[PDB]
């Protein structure tokens, strides 16, 4: 599923991501925009053989099991396929764990490079939320 901007904002809020660990909803929308272009089915292989999955491009090196990332962990206790669902529940639960791990949203390199410090409220501008 390819979400729209306000539709994704709405879904994130419903799943309690808005202001989670102090990160406003526009930060989460912005991260999703640049990690996956709002496509739940996004996958990208990393040079180290891990893969990033879903709307927030969660990495199999630590957070989910894909069966093909040797030496990896599965700290969200989920198959990485669950992260490609049209329903964002698994991605959201996992992102909560990720953003609580110590470095906040810096875990998401696109968020650090493209969202951090910017006018992130623009991402929820005009949305009925």
93 binds Cl ion (CB under 5 A): no
- 5 is a site residue for Cl ion (CB under 5 A): yes
The angle, 0 to 180 degrees and rounded to 10, between the axes of the packed helices 5-14 and 25-36 is 120
Question: What would the two tokens of residue 91 be?
Answer: 């991605």
101 annotated as ligand-binding: yes
7 binds Cl ion per the rule CB under 5 A: no
7 is catalytic: no
Nearer residue to Cl ion within complex by CB, 9 or 99: 9
Separation between Cα atoms, residue 64 and residue 67, nearest integer Å:
9
DSSP state of 55: T
Binding-residue pattern over the window 37 to 76 for Cl ion, x denoting contact by CB under 5 A = --------------------------------x--x----
Q: Which of 7, 52, 66, 87 is catalytic?
A: 52
Answer yes or no: 119 catalytic. Answer: no
The CA distance from 118 to 76, in Å, is 29
Closest CA to 61 of 99, 82, 51: 51
**Which of 42, 64, 88, 124 is close enough to bind Cl ion by CB under 5 A?**
88
């Amino acid at each position: 599923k390819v979400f729209g901007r306000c539709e994704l904002a709405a879904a994130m809020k419903r799943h309690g991501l808005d202001n989670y660990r102090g990160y406003s909803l526009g930060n989460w929308v912005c991260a999703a925009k640049f990690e996956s272009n709002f496509n739940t089915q996004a996958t990208n292989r990393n040079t180290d053989g891990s893969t990033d999955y879903g709307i927030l491009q969660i990495n199999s090196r630590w957070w989910c099991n894909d069966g093909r990332t040797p030496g990896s962990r599965n700290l969200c206790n989920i198959p990485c396929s669950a992260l490609l669902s049209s329903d964002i529940t698994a991605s959201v639960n996992c992102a909560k764990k990720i953003v609580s791990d110590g470095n906040g949203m810096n875990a998401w390199v696109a968020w650090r490079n493209r969202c951090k410090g910017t006018d992130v409220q623009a991402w929820i501008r005009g949305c009925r939320l």
